């Protein structure tokens, strides 16, 4: 289905809340392709479970910040955002909806 921010039959991995993107890091289309990324970055090494052991939630945070990274400034990922929540973006933003999503489920 094309319901934004809803759990689809294909979206079964992470928590499909593309709506939380801006809230994930505190950025959304206000920043350039520069700051949107910075926003994710300062969280990425911040919330990295490698740096924060015994914290599975940190991995979880690292996983949502992993997502919002592209979407906010990237029209393509924001386009997937309207279709796929965190799942489609998790794969499309990091590798590309065209190549890997067509390979996964």
Swiss-Prot record:
Signal peptide annotation: none
Transmembrane found in the keyword field: no
Miscellaneous field: Upon phosphorylation, Ser-15 interacts with Lys-63, a highly conserved residue in DnaJ proteins that is also a ubiquitination site in DNAJC5.
Modified residues (Phosphoserine): 13, 15, 17, 20
Modified residues (Phosphotyrosine): 22
Subcellular location field: Cytoplasm, Cytosol; Membrane; Cytoplasmic vesicle, Secretory vesicle, Chromaffin granule membrane; Melanosome
Name listed for the protein in its UniProt record: DnaJ homolog subfamily C member 5
Disulfide cross-links: none
First and last residues shown, out of full length: 1 to 100 of 198
Keywords from the named record: Acetylation, Cell membrane, Chaperone, Cytoplasm, Cytoplasmic vesicle, Disease variant, Lipoprotein, Membrane, Neurodegeneration, Neuronal ceroid lipofuscinosis, Palmitate, Phosphoprotein
Modified how: Ser-15 phosphorylation induces an order-to-disorder transition triggering the interaction with Lys-63. This conformational switch modulates DNAJC5's cellular functions by reducing binding to syntaxin and synaptogamin without altering HSC70 interactions. Palmitoylated. Could be palmitoylated by DHHC3, DHHC7, DHHC15 and DHHC17. Palmitoylation occurs probably in the cysteine-rich domain and regulates DNAJC5 membrane attachment.
Tissues of expression: Expressed in pancreas, kidney, skeletal muscle, liver, lung, placenta, brain and heart.
Sites bearing N6-acetyllysine, chain numbering: 61
Keyword Lipoprotein belongs to the record: yes
Gene Ontology molecular-function annotations: ATP-dependent protein binding
An example Gene Ontology biological process: regulation of synaptic vesicle cycle
Assembly and oligomerization: Oligomers. Homodimer. Interacts with the chaperone complex consisting of HSC70 and SGTA. Interacts with ZDHHC13 (via ANK repeats). Interacts with ZDHHC17 (via ANK repeats). Interacts with SYT1, SYT5 and SYT7, and with SYT9, forming a complex with SNAP25.
Bilayer topology: Lipid-anchor
Disease per UniProt entry: Ceroid lipofuscinosis, neuronal, 4B (Kufs type), autosomal dominant: An adult-onset neuronal ceroid lipofuscinosis. Neuronal ceroid lipofuscinoses are progressive neurodegenerative, lysosomal storage diseases characterized by intracellular accumulation of autofluorescent liposomal material, and clinically by seizures, dementia, visual loss, and/or cerebral atrophy. CLN4B has no visual involvement and is characterized by seizures and other neurologic symptoms.
Role this protein plays: Acts as a general chaperone in regulated exocytosis. Acts as a co-chaperone for the SNARE protein SNAP-25. Involved in the calcium-mediated control of a late stage of exocytosis. May have an important role in presynaptic function. May be involved in calcium-dependent neurotransmitter release at nerve endings.
Source species: Homo sapiens (Human)
Residue span(s) of domain J: 18-87
Gene that this sequence comes from: DNAJC5
GO CC terms: azurophil granule membrane; chromaffin granule membrane; clathrin-sculpted gamma-aminobutyric acid transport vesicle membrane; cytosol; intracellular membrane-bounded organelle; lysosomal membrane; melanosome; membrane
Superkingdom as given in the UniProt entry: Eukaryota
Lineage start: Eukaryota, Metazoa, Chordata, Craniata, Vertebrata
